[PDB]
Ligand binder design. Structure first.
Ligand SMILES: Cc1ncc(COP(=O)(O)O)c(/C=N/OCC[C@H](N)C(=O)O)c1O
Ligand SMILES: Cc1ncc(COP(=O)(O)O)c(/C=N/OCC[C@H](N)C(=O)O)c1O
Ligand SMILES: O=[N+]([O-])c1cc([N+](=O)[O-])c(O)c([N+](=O)[O-])c1
Ligand code: NA
Ligand code: NA
Lengths: 378, 383
């Protein structure tokens, strides 16, 4: 990036020179309520005057309240809080392994994961991730992880057995080209996990906390996982994460564990806004506003082969002529004053605030059209 | 057995080195949330930094830098051997980055086969699968399926053992200059210098985990400065953010080039850490840490004179360990819980060792009051 953001309000961001940008990136789907949302600032300041920190020896009122919100709203009966999606995934993957070890057999260790998956950058999580380029070169990887293609239920059936402890999947692969699970695939994972006494682990770090227009993507699909991870949007920009599971599974390790008081106070305020009928409905309204602009851009410039994703996770795949050039459009966008994402070198990605104003959708998309125009003019 | 608070002990408010629970019971905090709140609770400078940056910008992705991250990177670079800084959230993440970097540096500069990591019994480096496997407590790394391989453990402070296992296939030695969880055991000068010399000989990287002993804890900004032994990579967290989760991996340009001068860092986190750094890295605060250590130690000695409970008082700066006599082997949790009943929050470092990690600016009045409360608790335990 060739600029330094210094200030943000809602979906507008200013750099050191006072240039104004429309933010359709959200810090990679993190600032789900935009920058410096008044309710989140209020929660930060109030808890900031009270108590910031407890060790995991203790609980605290913000953690208890956030845990109760998540438990009441989801399949979860137990919640463990951490800082990042990577830590939440470490916890989920360790827990699925440990549960298999103590409830079934120490030899029940296979983890099935998917090509193009992203689960974090720790050694274990990057090894469960499905991009060999990112996991190569750090010495011996944690073993017993098998990768098959996303959306290939037959391949999962083929590799799964009584020695399998988990299937780990992103219901929508965000980094991996914004690819959504098909209904049959996701239901199939649930059935195969039931058959083999393995745990189904949904990584909802990117697609959770309202991103799809349901509180969690699993709710859209109607497929209940055993363990779910959440981060990013959960804290609206404050680092916080959660691992959600049942009492039966968590017992392999009170309804909550961990949680920074400050982080959890902010996440509570974020949860209270995102988990409302009006905000969730609005995510679908706004998706259509974005998609209509992307279609208009494609009609004018002929650059997209597909527009996909769910809610306000949007992917627009570039036509073969522009394969490999997502970064060129990202940089042209920045020049035109709009912040966008890629999802690999072939895919444009958008992950704006879930409450992005219509006026900002229109302005940012006009700027993006200008960017596309400048690139295609060459 | 872990230490866990019961349902009737939920902290709700902190100010300085005092904490109140839901019932309004007041505690003196000599634990700092396990050496995290190095400037105590709701320190006004940290609150101000939190609030001002909180009105401005909280978050950038790692695609961008931000002014708080740049300022904090510069402060750390100017104050230490570092030329490059990577910011993360937790000590576990910083250690993941450090260990991956040492592995990757060896892979690309020497050989993909140069993978051995040497670490120490009783080490604690975090709870991710890789960090807990580098950690030196098998009980905590057992039971998660196949561990990342090529990690060798030898006894802390045993230089012969390190020499024995190291070779040209070794990429790193990972060490806490003081093992905090492992009984508050400090490296001897010979041992730490020996690690540096062995790493130089074998072209391996010396990695200091200063998550607990760094950011002023020892009375120097980092423990490596006390020892005068410069690592290749250093990790910091806990005190760095004073209660806000933030961490850092510090290294040189030569090493980092295997992966400007700063990468990552949450704007809000880095604003708070900048304010924390500005206070801790002062001659007066650093001197005060030594004064305050001796105030604690004199109290512990007075307790021992009265009750005969300790075989050793150790640590550095305001990381203090007090080892229980054999008569009280395995009683550390009981003294901790008795302390809480008496209104003082303390730590353990294994079942045989009391640990103290108070605010680096803990007021003398709080030292005296909390230690009087601790004496009362001891009296109840040994009656
Ligand atoms: C599905 C999914 N699972 C886990 C993670 C890791 O979460 P994090 O540690 O909170 O960044 C992520 C994080 N994505 O972050 C953006 C890419 C990333 N910035 C990187 O390469 O580190 C994710 O998308
Ligand atoms: C030398 C050393 N290295 C790494 C870490 C991990 O740092 P963290 O991820 O910031 O907690 C620590 C953290 N210790 O904290 C205590 C334990 C904590 N509740 C846990 O079990 O993770 C440490 O002392
Ligand atoms: O080791 N343990 O199984 C264990 C269990 C509980 N508990 O509430 O059921 C504790 O509070 C603690 N504890 O106090 O650390 C330990
Ligand atoms: Na529930
Ligand atoms: Na330097």
């Amino acid at each position: 990036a060739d600029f330094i953001p210094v200030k943000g309000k809602g979906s507008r961001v200013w750099d050191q020179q006072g240039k104004e940008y429309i933010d359709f990136a959200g810090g990679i789907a993190v600032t789900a309520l935009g920058h410096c949302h008044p309710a989140l600032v209020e929660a930060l300041k109030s808890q900031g005057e009270t108590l910031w920190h407890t060790s995991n020896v203790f609980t605290n009122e913000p953690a208890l309240r956030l845990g109760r919100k998540l438990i009441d709203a989801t399949f979860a009966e137990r919640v463990l809080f951490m800082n990042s999606g990577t830590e939440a995934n470490e916890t989920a993957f360790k827990l699925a392994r440990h549960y298999a070890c103590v409830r079934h057999s120490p030899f029940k260790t296979k983890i099935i994961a998917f090509h193009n998956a992203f689960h974090g950058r720790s050694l274990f999580t990057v090894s469960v991730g499905g991009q060999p380029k990112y996991s190569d070169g750090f010495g011996p990887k944690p073993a017993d992880i098998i990768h098959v293609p996303f959306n290939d239920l037959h391949a999962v059936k083929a590799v799964m057995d009584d020695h399998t402890c988990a299937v780990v999947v992103e219901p929508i692969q965000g980094e991996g080209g914004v690819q959504a699970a098909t209904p049959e695939f996701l239901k199939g994972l649930r059935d195969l996990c039931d058959e083999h006494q393995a745990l189904l682990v949904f990584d909802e770090v990117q697609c959770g906390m309202g991103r799809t227009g349901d509180l969690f993507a699993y709710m859209h699909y109607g497929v209940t996982p055993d363990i779910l991870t959440s981060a990013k949007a959960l804290g609206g920009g404050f680092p916080v994460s959660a691992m959600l599971t049942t009492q039966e599974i968590a017992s392999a390790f009170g309804s909550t564990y961990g949680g920074n008081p400050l982080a959890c106070a902010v996440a509570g305020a974020t949860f209270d806004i995102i988990n409302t009928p009006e905000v969730l409905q609005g995510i679908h309204t706004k998706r259509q506003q974005f998609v209509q602009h992307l279609q208009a851009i494609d009609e004018q410039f002929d650059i997209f082969s597909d527009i996909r994703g769910m809610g306000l996770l949007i992917g627009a795949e570039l036509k073969p002529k522009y394969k490999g050039r997502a970064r060129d459009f990202l940089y042209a966008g920045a020049e035109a004053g709009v912040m966008v994402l890629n999802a690999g070198a072939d895919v444009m990605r958008f992950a704006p605030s879930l409450v992005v104003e219509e006026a900002d959708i229109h302005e940012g998309m006009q700027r993006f059209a200008q960017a596309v125009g400048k690139v295609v003019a060459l």
